[PDB]
Design a protein around this motif. Structure first.
Motif, PDB file in Angstrom:
ATOM      1  N   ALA A 606     -25.045 -12.012   5.878  1.00 25.87           N
ATOM      2  CA  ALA A 606     -25.320 -13.201   6.662  1.00 25.87           C
ATOM      3  C   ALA A 606     -24.159 -13.541   7.612  1.00 25.87           C
ATOM      4  O   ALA A 606     -24.387 -13.798   8.791  1.00 25.87           O
ATOM      5  CB  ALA A 606     -25.688 -14.389   5.749  1.00 25.87           C
ATOM      6  N   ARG A 610     -24.010 -13.667  11.811  1.00 25.68           N
ATOM      7  CA  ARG A 610     -23.383 -14.770  12.570  1.00 25.68           C
ATOM      8  C   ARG A 610     -22.325 -14.326  13.601  1.00 25.68           C
ATOM      9  O   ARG A 610     -22.186 -14.926  14.631  1.00 25.68           O
ATOM     10  CB  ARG A 610     -22.843 -15.832  11.625  1.00 25.68           C
ATOM     11  CG  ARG A 610     -24.009 -16.629  11.055  1.00 25.68           C
ATOM     12  CD  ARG A 610     -23.664 -17.721  10.115  1.00 25.68           C
ATOM     13  NE  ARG A 610     -24.948 -18.370   9.851  1.00 25.68           N
ATOM     14  CZ  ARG A 610     -25.568 -18.360   8.683  1.00 25.68           C
ATOM     15  NH1 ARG A 610     -24.989 -17.783   7.612  1.00 25.68           N
ATOM     16  NH2 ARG A 610     -26.753 -18.961   8.587  1.00 25.68           N
ATOM     17  N   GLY A 622     -28.966 -14.828  14.603  1.00 28.04           N
ATOM     18  CA  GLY A 622     -28.798 -16.160  14.032  1.00 28.04           C
ATOM     19  C   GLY A 622     -30.015 -16.562  13.206  1.00 28.04           C
ATOM     20  O   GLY A 622     -29.879 -17.212  12.157  1.00 28.04           O
ATOM     21  N   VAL A 623     -31.198 -16.214  13.696  1.00 26.25           N
ATOM     22  CA  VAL A 623     -32.438 -16.450  12.958  1.00 26.25           C
ATOM     23  C   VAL A 623     -32.484 -15.650  11.651  1.00 26.25           C
ATOM     24  O   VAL A 623     -32.840 -16.179  10.582  1.00 26.25           O
ATOM     25  CB  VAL A 623     -33.672 -16.112  13.830  1.00 26.25           C
ATOM     26  CG1 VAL A 623     -34.928 -16.205  12.965  1.00 26.25           C
ATOM     27  CG2 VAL A 623     -33.721 -17.018  15.115  1.00 26.25           C
ATOM     28  N   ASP A 626     -29.951 -17.377   9.166  1.00 28.43           N
ATOM     29  CA  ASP A 626     -30.521 -18.607   8.606  1.00 28.43           C
ATOM     30  C   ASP A 626     -31.531 -18.306   7.493  1.00 28.43           C
ATOM     31  O   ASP A 626     -31.482 -18.917   6.418  1.00 28.43           O
ATOM     32  CB  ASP A 626     -31.222 -19.458   9.672  1.00 28.43           C
ATOM     33  CG  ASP A 626     -30.259 -20.095  10.712  1.00 28.43           C
ATOM     34  OD1 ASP A 626     -29.053 -20.229  10.475  1.00 28.43           O
ATOM     35  OD2 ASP A 626     -30.754 -20.506  11.782  1.00 28.43           O
ATOM     36  N   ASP A 629     -29.746 -16.913   4.389  1.00 25.91           N
ATOM     37  CA  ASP A 629     -29.095 -17.949   3.595  1.00 25.91           C
ATOM     38  C   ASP A 629     -30.087 -18.560   2.604  1.00 25.91           C
ATOM     39  O   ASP A 629     -29.781 -18.740   1.419  1.00 25.91           O
ATOM     40  CB  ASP A 629     -28.579 -19.122   4.468  1.00 25.91           C
ATOM     41  CG  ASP A 629     -27.398 -18.763   5.364  1.00 25.91           C
ATOM     42  OD1 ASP A 629     -26.639 -17.777   5.152  1.00 25.91           O
ATOM     43  OD2 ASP A 629     -27.197 -19.550   6.298  1.00 25.91           O
ATOM     44  N   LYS A 630     -31.273 -18.922   3.116  1.00 25.03           N
ATOM     45  CA  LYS A 630     -32.306 -19.562   2.317  1.00 25.03           C
ATOM     46  C   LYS A 630     -32.844 -18.577   1.241  1.00 25.03           C
ATOM     47  O   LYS A 630     -33.143 -19.005   0.129  1.00 25.03           O
ATOM     48  CB  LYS A 630     -33.475 -20.033   3.228  1.00 25.03           C
ATOM     49  CG  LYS A 630     -33.061 -21.109   4.252  1.00 25.03           C
ATOM     50  CD  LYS A 630     -34.186 -22.008   4.737  1.00 25.03           C
ATOM     51  CE  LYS A 630     -33.664 -23.115   5.658  1.00 25.03           C
ATOM     52  NZ  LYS A 630     -33.063 -22.570   6.948  1.00 25.03           N
ATOM     53  N   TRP A 662     -36.559 -13.270   1.893  1.00 25.41           N
ATOM     54  CA  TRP A 662     -36.021 -13.227   3.233  1.00 25.41           C
ATOM     55  C   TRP A 662     -37.194 -13.058   4.231  1.00 25.41           C
ATOM     56  O   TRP A 662     -37.271 -13.777   5.251  1.00 25.41           O
ATOM     57  CB  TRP A 662     -35.006 -12.059   3.327  1.00 25.41           C
ATOM     58  CG  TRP A 662     -34.223 -11.962   4.591  1.00 25.41           C
ATOM     59  CD1 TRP A 662     -34.080 -12.920   5.561  1.00 25.41           C
ATOM     60  CD2 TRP A 662     -33.376 -10.885   4.970  1.00 25.41           C
ATOM     61  NE1 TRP A 662     -33.214 -12.487   6.519  1.00 25.41           N
ATOM     62  CE2 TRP A 662     -32.769 -11.236   6.187  1.00 25.41           C
ATOM     63  CE3 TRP A 662     -33.062  -9.652   4.389  1.00 25.41           C
ATOM     64  CZ2 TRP A 662     -31.907 -10.372   6.882  1.00 25.41           C
ATOM     65  CZ3 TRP A 662     -32.197  -8.797   5.066  1.00 25.41           C
ATOM     66  CH2 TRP A 662     -31.636  -9.156   6.314  1.00 25.41           C
ATOM     67  N   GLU A 665     -39.140 -16.322   4.612  1.00 25.78           N
ATOM     68  CA  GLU A 665     -38.467 -17.312   5.424  1.00 25.78           C
ATOM     69  C   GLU A 665     -38.592 -16.962   6.900  1.00 25.78           C
ATOM     70  O   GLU A 665     -38.751 -17.847   7.739  1.00 25.78           O
ATOM     71  CB  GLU A 665     -36.983 -17.355   5.104  1.00 25.78           C
ATOM     72  CG  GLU A 665     -36.570 -18.011   3.820  1.00 25.78           C
ATOM     73  CD  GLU A 665     -37.053 -19.440   3.667  1.00 25.78           C
ATOM     74  OE1 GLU A 665     -37.268 -19.850   2.509  1.00 25.78           O
ATOM     75  OE2 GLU A 665     -37.210 -20.143   4.687  1.00 25.78           O
ATOM     76  N   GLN A 669     -40.329 -19.551   9.646  1.00 29.03           N
ATOM     77  CA  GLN A 669     -39.504 -20.235  10.667  1.00 29.03           C
ATOM     78  C   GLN A 669     -40.216 -20.305  12.033  1.00 29.03           C
ATOM     79  O   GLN A 669     -41.033 -19.438  12.357  1.00 29.03           O
ATOM     80  CB  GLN A 669     -38.100 -19.630  10.751  1.00 29.03           C
ATOM     81  CG  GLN A 669     -38.013 -18.151  11.167  1.00 29.03           C
ATOM     82  CD  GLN A 669     -38.369 -17.911  12.633  1.00 29.03           C
ATOM     83  OE1 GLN A 669     -38.012 -18.698  13.537  1.00 29.03           O
ATOM     84  NE2 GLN A 669     -39.084 -16.844  12.871  1.00 29.03           N
ATOM     85  N   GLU A 671     -38.395 -20.992  15.001  1.00 25.44           N
ATOM     86  CA  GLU A 671     -37.358 -20.932  16.032  1.00 25.44           C
ATOM     87  C   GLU A 671     -37.580 -19.749  16.980  1.00 25.44           C
ATOM     88  O   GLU A 671     -37.173 -19.801  18.135  1.00 25.44           O
ATOM     89  CB  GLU A 671     -35.962 -20.817  15.410  1.00 25.44           C
ATOM     90  CG  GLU A 671     -35.605 -21.931  14.454  1.00 25.44           C
ATOM     91  CD  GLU A 671     -35.223 -23.192  15.168  1.00 25.44           C
ATOM     92  OE1 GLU A 671     -34.268 -23.151  15.976  1.00 25.44           O
ATOM     93  OE2 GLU A 671     -35.886 -24.226  14.932  1.00 25.44           O
TER      94      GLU A 671
END
Ligand SMILES: NC(=O)c1ccc[n+]([C@@H]2O[C@H](COP(=O)([O-])OP(=O)(O)OC[C@H]3O[C@@H](n4cnc5c(N)ncnc54)[C@H](OP(=O)(O)O)[C@@H]3O)[C@@H](O)[C@H]2O)c1
Ligand SMILES: [Mg+2]
Length: 735
Positions: A606, A610, A622-623, A626, A629-630, A662, A665, A669, A671
């Motif tokens: 992760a 970043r 970045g997506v 994120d 992380d979750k 993963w 998520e 998302q 985004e």
């Protein structure tokens, strides 16, 4: 852009055959390539002796190429634990490779010819910690991982209750130590300097012939006084005895390999004052001085044969002195037996966490007098002790967090000092002499004093300041530089921090400079009320803070984000600080259960994403980060990290559930709608198939497994073993 995933050894190697193909598939959706490079022990051996190999056998020099990579903005390296070879491991690897047809030479056991001398020198470059010094072209950014922090909140580790009546305290020198005797300068131009001793005689002895320094480099010289040290120690022995608390002593004998064993010896001789008062000349002549611990002394006594009455005197010392903190009660091992047994950055947080107790001869908790002879860092721990006495134990469910930005590049400060540390033999002075003849630094010294010099370079300092600003800006957390006004070195660094902070936009950021004691106090005041403070520190405090705060916040320092922002703008993301778990491989050989925990890999990954987001403009990375992380948070929530036990979830299973969460998520998302459509069918496939894939990953366990090797396993066998479920592989390989 490309992420290099290191192919290492033993347990992480096996995990990599399962995890890397998943990482490669997911990464490609953000236009990122993932490739392995082979820094295994076996691979590094082959790289060292290409001349003996056929073209098909050759590996290419992956460590050297990664070293070059690290000096470019292109570098993005995920580094997993690897072997730092002992001679036995090296011999075992050599033999294994020879058995497999690689015609490499034997490790010479007594080189006489020039060829043998060359082969030994080449193998000696491959053993030990060969990898870290090539890859760490930077300072340190270390943080408690948020996914782990959030779980601790749910399920906190034990924190011992503190009493206001506790008598535990640190004792440290008041004067005449490295901190108070330190002098420091900043070089105006490059210079090759000399370190010299001039005895009261006039007799010059060169201690170090040549020391190349750069323009702007910070140079310190300092002395620990043997006489003050001895006076101090004898007093603390008496204090622990009068107060009825455990005598303990906390050094870094392993890392500080020259100074700290000497200091340790002084400790042992202080405790056994009466013994050395009566047999001191003899013991010291025989090398039985305590610098290798009381255990070395005891063992050596049978060669002396007035050793029996000396043995008796040591035994009497133990009955008459203060009670000692124990390393192993069942074996009768005290703090004094082996210098490396009690290591300050581990021992001090463990004692604080355990209500400020260490363990006595009865295996019961007891207050301690914690001796930390040099005063440079002692006050950090004392300040925490006093706070716990006043306010009670920290509460991990509500406390804030204290990351560290640490000045490490090019063996900064004390961790580069081992070749500039000298046990003084005669009264006189020590001079650092400039090429022109000028005396740059001078100290008076007495016999048995310890003289030390340290260097940190200006570019590492500038990089360190930039990293502090960057961390504060990105995180929103205030940054505090921990610099002691009473140290010459820290006064020089403070003047430079002020200079360089002006190169950065700091509007909106809260950045200040405080003493280590003031900084510790602010940090813990904030921590108790749920707030966060970044500690910006030198090399030793890096090493200390990165144990102390994680152990208090999380129960352990073994689960951390550890980043080395590379000089040329790349990044190195180290997944773990431990070894490569040979027992974990044994278990797979025996019953095909891999208990290796890949958590550190998920976290470093992760952060690697970043880096691409922050430095290379990669919005999809970045997506991916994120979502990852979750997914990590959910894996921990369901406790789907590997079990130790056969028949239960293992490393491969954890990878499956991590990949399922993963993908979920990424599909959920909003985004990046295109990423969402890519992962919607992936998530659907893994969900529909989860019951079957999970059962299958349990079903492969139970029986003996053939890796085709150990240091040099067979690639076909490892693939089939670590990727055994076609239904899962088909989903990953299709994406
Ligand atoms: O460094 P070093 O080689 O001197 O010693 P070390 O890594 O501290 O000791 C190796 C042992 O630590 C545990 N360990 C280390 N990494 C682990 C990981 N990623 N997942 C689960 N357990 C891990 C294992 O204990 P267990 O044997 O209890 O699994 C392993 O056998
Ligand atoms: Mg440490």
């Amino acid at each position: 852009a490309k992420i290099i995933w290191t192919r290492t050894d033993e347990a992480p190697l096996l995990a990599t055959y399962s995890l890397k193909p998943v990482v490669e598939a997911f990464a490609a959706t953000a236009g990122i390539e993932v490739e392995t490079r082979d820094i295994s022990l076996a691979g590094r051996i082959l790289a060292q002796f290409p001349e003996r190999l056929t073209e098909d056998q050759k590996v290419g020099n992956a460590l050297a190429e990664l070293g070059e990579l690290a000096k470019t903005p292109e570098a993005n390296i995920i580094k997993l634990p690897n072997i730092s070879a002992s001679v036995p491991q090296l011999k075992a690897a050599i033999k294994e490779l020879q058995d497999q047809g690689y015609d490499i030479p034997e490790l010479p056991d007594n080189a006489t010819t020039d060829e043998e001398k060359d082969i030994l020198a080449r193998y000696n470059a491959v053993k030990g910690s060969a990898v870290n010094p090539v890859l760490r072209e930077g300072n340190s950014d270390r943080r408690a991982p948020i996914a782990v922090k959030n779980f601790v909140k749910k399920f906190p580790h034990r924190m011992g209750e503190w009493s206001a009546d506790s008598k535990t305290n640190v004792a440290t020198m008041d004067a005449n130590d490295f901190r108070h005797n330190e002098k420091s300068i900043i070089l105006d131009a490059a210079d090759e300097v000399q370190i010299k001793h001039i005895a009261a005689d006039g007799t010059e002895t060169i201690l170090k012939d040549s020391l190349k320094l750069l323009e702007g480099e910070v140079l310190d010289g300092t002395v620990l006084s043997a006489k003050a040290l001895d006076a101090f120690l004898l007093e603390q022995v008496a204090r622990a005895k009068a107060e009825g608390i455990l005598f303990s002593a906390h050094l870094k004998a392993t890392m500080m390999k020259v100074s700290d064993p000497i200091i340790f010896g002084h400790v042992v001789r202080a405790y056994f004052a009466d013994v050395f008062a009566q047999y001191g000349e003899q013991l010291l002549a025989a090398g039985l001085n305590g610098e290798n611990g009381l255990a070395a002394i005891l063992s050596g006594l049978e060669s002396l044969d007035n050793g029996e009455e000396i043995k008796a005197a040591f035994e009497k010392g133990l009955e008459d002195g203060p009670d000692l903190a124990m390393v192993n009660s069942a074996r009768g091992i005290t703090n004094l037996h082996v210098p490396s047994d009690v290591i300050v950055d581990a021992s001090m947080p463990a004692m604080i966490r355990t209500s400020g107790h260490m363990w006595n001869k009865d295996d019961q908790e007891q207050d301690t007098l914690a001796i930390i002879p040099d005063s440079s860092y002692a006050g950090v721990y004392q300040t925490v002790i006093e706070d716990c006495r006043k306010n009670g134990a920290f509460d991990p469910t509500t406390m804030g967090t204290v990351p560290n930005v640490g000045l490490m590049a090019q063996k900064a400060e004390e961790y580069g000092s081992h070749d500039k540390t000298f046990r003084i033999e005669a009264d006189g002075v020590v001079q650092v002499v400039s090429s022109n003849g000028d005396v740059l630094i001078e100290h008076d010294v007495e016999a048995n004093d310890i003289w030390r010099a340290c260097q940190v370079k200006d570019a590492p300092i500038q990089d360190w300041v930039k990293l502090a600003v960057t961390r504060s800006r990105l995180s929103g957390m205030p940054a505090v530089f921990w610099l002691d006004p009473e140290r010459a070195h820290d006064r020089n660094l403070a003047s430079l921090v002020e200079k360089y902070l002006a190169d950065h936009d700091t509007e909106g950021l809260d950045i200040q400079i405080l003493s280590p004691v003031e900084a510790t106090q602010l940090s813990i005041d904030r921590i108790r009320r749920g707030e966060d403070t970044i500690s910006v520190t030198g090399n030793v405090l890096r090493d200390y803070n990165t144990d102390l705060f994680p152990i208090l916040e999380l129960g352990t320092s073994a689960k951390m984000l550890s980043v080395v922002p590379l000089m040329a703008g790349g990044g190195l993301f180290e997944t773990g600080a431990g070894g490569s778990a040979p027992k974990h491989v044994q278990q797979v050989q025996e019953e095909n259960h891999l208990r290796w925990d890949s958590l550190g890999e998920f976290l470093a990954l992760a952060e690697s994403f970043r880096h691409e987001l922050n430095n290379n403009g990669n919005t999809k990375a970045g997506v991916l980060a994120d979502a990852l992380d979750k997914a990590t948070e959910k894996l921990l929530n369901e406790e789907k990290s590997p079990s130790r036990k056969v028949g239960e979830i293992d490393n491969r299973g954890s990878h499956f559930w991590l990949t399922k969460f993963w993908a979920d998520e990424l599909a959920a998302q909003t985004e990046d709608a295109d990423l969402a459509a890519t992962f919607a069918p992936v998530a659907e496939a893994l969900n529909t198939g989860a019951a079957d894939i999970d059962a299958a990953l349990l079903a492969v366990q139970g029986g003996a497994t053939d890796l085709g090797g150990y240091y040099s396993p067979n690639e076909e066998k490892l693939t089939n073993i670590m990727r055994p479920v076609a239904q899962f592989n088909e989903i990953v390989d299709a994406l």
